Design an enzyme around this catalytic site. Structure first.
Site, mmCIF file in Angstrom:
data_model
loop_
_atom_site.group_PDB
_atom_site.id
_atom_site.type_symbol
_atom_site.label_atom_id
_atom_site.label_comp_id
_atom_site.label_asym_id
_atom_site.label_seq_id
_atom_site.Cartn_x
_atom_site.Cartn_y
_atom_site.Cartn_z
ATOM 1 N N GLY A 112 0.795 -1.222 0.000
ATOM 2 C CA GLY A 112 0.000 0.000 0.000
ATOM 3 C C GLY A 112 0.825 1.268 0.000
ATOM 4 O O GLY A 112 1.943 1.284 0.519
ATOM 5 N N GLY A 145 0.166 5.900 -0.126
ATOM 6 C CA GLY A 145 -0.769 7.012 -0.015
ATOM 7 C C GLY A 145 -0.254 8.218 0.734
ATOM 8 O O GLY A 145 0.958 8.405 0.885
ATOM 9 N N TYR A 172 -1.073 8.796 3.900
ATOM 10 C CA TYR A 172 -0.801 8.228 5.223
ATOM 11 C C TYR A 172 0.671 7.790 5.393
ATOM 12 O O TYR A 172 1.243 7.943 6.473
ATOM 13 C CB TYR A 172 -1.766 7.046 5.497
ATOM 14 C CG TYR A 172 -1.719 5.926 4.473
ATOM 15 C CD1 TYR A 172 -0.818 4.874 4.601
ATOM 16 C CD2 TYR A 172 -2.611 5.892 3.405
ATOM 17 C CE1 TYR A 172 -0.753 3.855 3.653
ATOM 18 C CE2 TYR A 172 -2.578 4.859 2.465
ATOM 19 C CZ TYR A 172 -1.653 3.834 2.601
ATOM 20 O OH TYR A 172 -1.608 2.802 1.694
ATOM 21 N N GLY A 173 1.245 7.266 4.313
ATOM 22 C CA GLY A 173 2.606 6.753 4.242
ATOM 23 C C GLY A 173 2.678 5.530 3.353
ATOM 24 O O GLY A 173 2.146 5.542 2.241
ATOM 25 N N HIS A 174 3.327 4.464 3.840
ATOM 26 C CA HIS A 174 3.491 3.196 3.121
ATOM 27 C C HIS A 174 3.080 2.029 4.015
ATOM 28 O O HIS A 174 3.213 2.122 5.235
ATOM 29 C CB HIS A 174 4.950 3.002 2.683
ATOM 30 C CG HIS A 174 5.532 4.168 1.949
ATOM 31 N ND1 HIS A 174 5.452 4.269 0.570
ATOM 32 C CD2 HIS A 174 6.198 5.246 2.431
ATOM 33 C CE1 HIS A 174 6.064 5.400 0.258
ATOM 34 N NE2 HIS A 174 6.532 6.021 1.344
ATOM 35 N N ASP A 224 -12.655 10.774 6.899
ATOM 36 C CA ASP A 224 -12.254 10.354 5.558
ATOM 37 C C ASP A 224 -12.611 8.879 5.222
ATOM 38 O O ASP A 224 -11.838 8.208 4.545
ATOM 39 C CB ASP A 224 -10.752 10.654 5.302
ATOM 40 C CG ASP A 224 -10.323 10.558 3.842
ATOM 41 O OD1 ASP A 224 -11.015 11.140 2.977
ATOM 42 O OD2 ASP A 224 -9.310 9.879 3.566
HETATM 43 C C1 LIG Z 1 -1.861 3.157 -4.781
HETATM 44 N N1 LIG Z 1 -2.572 1.891 -4.603
HETATM 45 C C2 LIG Z 1 -3.205 1.381 -5.821
HETATM 46 C C3 LIG Z 1 -2.630 1.268 -3.409
HETATM 47 O O1 LIG Z 1 -2.090 1.731 -2.413
HETATM 48 C C4 LIG Z 1 -3.400 -0.052 -3.327
HETATM 49 N N2 LIG Z 1 -3.960 -0.262 -2.003
HETATM 50 C C5 LIG Z 1 -3.347 -0.817 -0.941
HETATM 51 C C6 LIG Z 1 -4.248 -0.797 0.096
HETATM 52 C C7 LIG Z 1 -4.073 -1.302 1.484
HETATM 53 C C8 LIG Z 1 -5.027 -1.037 2.465
HETATM 54 C C9 LIG Z 1 -4.873 -1.521 3.752
HETATM 55 C C10 LIG Z 1 -3.745 -2.255 4.121
HETATM 56 C C11 LIG Z 1 -3.595 -2.772 5.512
HETATM 57 C C12 LIG Z 1 -3.669 -4.145 5.753
HETATM 58 N N3 LIG Z 1 -3.616 -4.710 6.968
HETATM 59 C C13 LIG Z 1 -3.596 -3.904 8.024
HETATM 60 C C14 LIG Z 1 -3.514 -2.492 7.944
HETATM 61 C C15 LIG Z 1 -3.456 -1.645 9.074
HETATM 62 C C16 LIG Z 1 -3.405 -0.297 8.885
HETATM 63 N N4 LIG Z 1 -3.447 0.295 7.682
HETATM 64 C C17 LIG Z 1 -3.509 -0.489 6.611
HETATM 65 C C18 LIG Z 1 -3.543 -1.902 6.648
HETATM 66 C C19 LIG Z 1 -2.797 -2.533 3.133
HETATM 67 C C20 LIG Z 1 -2.956 -2.066 1.837
HETATM 68 C C21 LIG Z 1 -5.405 -0.219 -0.461
HETATM 69 N N5 LIG Z 1 -5.235 0.105 -1.728
#
Ligand SMILES: CN(C)C(=O)Cn1cc(-c2ccc(-c3cncc4ccncc34)cc2)cn1
Lengths: 330, 264
Positions: free
Chosen positions: A29, A31, A33-35, A145
């Site tokens: 992930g 954004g 928020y970070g990575h 959000d």
């Molecule tokens: C630019 N792009 C296309 C992307 O980033 C694609 N994407 C990636 C995500 C994503 C959403 C949540 C998590 C996650 C999982 N498990 C626990 C978490 C605890 C706290 N935060 C996030 C957590 C991981 C990835 C959503 N979309």
């Protein structure tokens, strides 16, 4: 400034994220928020996946501050649990640790609209989103959000099919309440409810109800899309619309006549959702233009929609096989 | 945030035992007497209050900063981190937690320099020696050593709720609010729930203003023996206030205070 022995002791005893977890090339992930990384413990004490969130920028930002402060206090099955905080002293980066959530509504919805969502799963997802936001609202915490990318769903394991609301650190305005788009200065409980309404509509149709093409609060094209779906609000529907800071701009740029054959009934009927269903009546109560006329999270949970067959389940997938693919490494 | 106090980190981890607190203090009590140690605690409470006032921060922010400062030294020696650096760092962190914002590098350093120069020249003959890099380093240590407990409950919100419920907002609230501020000259925030501190402050305010609130207090169903313990501390703090001359005593007390050891 600081005692030598104090610094040396703490440095020797301080747990470092790179010593505890393997995450190099495990980014899933990205954004504002970070990575986010899908990590595994370096010590074989567990084989479970962990989510490592490297916060944006160095030091303690306002976002990093809000997330740490709140998640340190909040304890609910539908709100993401903060397990540990790593403060990397070398590069001043903040790391947040949670249990890994294999799924989220952004990926679930994307999978379904690519085909062109089971109704029991839609109901269970909405019940758990409302349960989580009601807990937050009872603790005077506003999300500010909510969107499909923030509604995480647990994969196989001891919490299979459990919804987790993520991103407590708070380009696209599809989930933004109409009063924010008209200049409302403060975030409210009602703003979160509107976002839930948007998510519910999207879960029922696989389409973002207020999808719109791409710094002031007033966003014309977004309001135009809201009115194309909802219709233009009548004076009786939203009396305090005149009190909105952008009301004069709204009067200058729009004419209620343009949206005469527009209504949520007409929109939902095109996407095969019946206007007499309990689902529609609940959706309409969540997507109320006037924020004071919008249903609360507790009232929404008491809706007869959740008493109608099928009942909501703790596992949103209800013991059925998960068709959704696992998140790919960026 | 406005969550249930009984499920908070403040209650589950930062409501300490007086004896465990006295035992941790022993490390610094080899250089300073018990009397000098509480005098030093009042001084830095007044430094944090002056820092907040200069920066035009709400009482909520100052109270949060003060509790951070006290929680840090409840577990660590005065020699660990210089309290002169900890006080503005606590203000800096509290301002972020309380959604006030990030105080700029310029505004924070100038506030610490000006406040110590203007209001505390009797205790500090030299200018504030720290820069922003020191605050940012101290911030990382402060967050870690508080186990990332940032949400702090204060007696102001329950005090306002109690006084409104009495129907005596105009008469009692200005004095009771002032007594709550004075409470930060003590360890009360580390030993008792905020609602209990608020009730005792309201009680002292009723006694001072000569108002009969016996029946209102009697209909509460709270541990009155614990409210009485707090009342005794409040009365004691004003006797301490009378006998303490901050301006004549603090340069000597700060000189006795253990200093951070440098690298070999
Ligand atoms: C630019 N792009 C296309 C992307 O980033 C694609 N994407 C990636 C995500 C994503 C959403 C949540 C998590 C996650 C999982 N498990 C626990 C978490 C605890 C706290 N935060 C996030 C957590 C991981 C990835 C959503 N979309």
């Amino acid at each position: 400034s600081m005692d030598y022995d104090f610094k040396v002791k703490l440095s020797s005893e301080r747990e470092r994220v790179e010593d505890l977890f393997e995450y190099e090339g495990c980014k899933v992930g990205r954004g504002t928020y970070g990575h986010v990384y899908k990590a595994k413990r370096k010590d074989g004490k567990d084989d479970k996946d962990y989510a490592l969130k490297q916060i944006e920028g160095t030091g303690i930002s306002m976002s990093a501050c809000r997330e740490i402060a709140l998640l340190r206090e909040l304890k609910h099955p539908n709100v993401i649990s903060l397990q540990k905080v790593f403060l990397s002293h070398a590069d001043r980066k903040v790391w947040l640790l949670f249990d890994y959530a294999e799924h989220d509504l952004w990926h679930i919805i994307k999978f379904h609209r690519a085909s062109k969502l089971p109704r029991g799963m839609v109901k269970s997802l909405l019940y758990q989103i409302l349960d989580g936001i009601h807990y937050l609202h009872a603790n005077w915490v506003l999300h500010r959000d909510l969107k499909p990318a923030n509604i995480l769903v647990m994969g196989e394991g001891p919490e299979r099919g459990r919804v987790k609301i993520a991103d407590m650190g708070f380009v696209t305005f599809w989930y933004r309440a109409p009063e924010l788009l008209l200049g409302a200065r403060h975030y409210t409980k009602a703003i979160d409810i509107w976002a839930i309404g948007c998510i519910f509509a999207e879960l029922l149709t696989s389409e973002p109800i207020f999808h719109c093409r791409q710094s002031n609060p007033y966003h014309h094209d977004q309001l135009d899309r809201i009115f194309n779906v909802m219709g233009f609000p009548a004076d009786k529907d939203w009396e305090d619309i005149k009190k909105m800071p952008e009301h004069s701009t709204l009067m200058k740029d729009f004419r209620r006549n343009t949206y005469t054959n527009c209504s949520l009934i007409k929109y939902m009927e095109k996407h095969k959702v019946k206007p007499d269903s309990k689902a529609f009546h609940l959706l309409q109560k969540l997507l109320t233009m006037d924020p004071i006329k919008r249903i609360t999270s507790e009232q929404a949970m008491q809706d007869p929609y959740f008493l109608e067959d099928p009942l909501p389940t703790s596992d949103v997938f209800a013991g059925c096989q998960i068709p959704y693919p696992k998140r790919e490494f960026l | 945030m406005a969550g249930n106090f009984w499920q908070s980190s403040h209650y589950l981890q930062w409501i300490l035992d007086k004896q465990d607190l006295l035992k941790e203090r022993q490390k610094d009590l080899k250089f300073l007497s018990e009397e000098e140690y509480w005098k030093l605690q009042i001084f830095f409470t007044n430094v944090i209050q002056a820092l907040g006032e200069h920066l035009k921060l709400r009482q909520q922010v100052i109270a949060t900063a003060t509790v951070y400062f006290k929680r840090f030294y409840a577990r660590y020696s005065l020699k660990s981190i210089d309290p002169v650096l900890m006080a503005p760092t606590c203000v800096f962190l509290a301002s972020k937690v309380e959604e006030f914002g990030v105080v700029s590098n310029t505004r924070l350093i100038a506030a610490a320099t000006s406040v110590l120069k203007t209001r505390f020249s009797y205790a500090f003959p030299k200018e504030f020696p720290y820069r922003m890099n020191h605050i940012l380093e101290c911030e990382f240590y402060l967050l870690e050593l508080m186990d990332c407990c940032l949400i702090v409950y204060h007696p102001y919100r329950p005090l306002l709720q109690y006084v409104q419920d009495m129907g005596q907002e105009d008469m009692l609230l200005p004095l009771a609010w002032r007594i709550v501020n004075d409470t930060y000259r003590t360890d009360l925030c580390l030993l008792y729930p905020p609602f209990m501190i608020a009730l005792a402050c309201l009680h002292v305010a009723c006694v001072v203003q000569q108002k009969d609130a016996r029946q209102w207090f009697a209909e509460l169903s709270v541990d009155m023996e614990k409210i009485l313990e707090i009342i005794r501390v409040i009365l004691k703090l004003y006797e301490q206030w009378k006998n303490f001359d901050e301006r004549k005593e603090m340069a000597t007390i700060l000189s006795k205070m253990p200093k951070p050891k440098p690298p070999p």
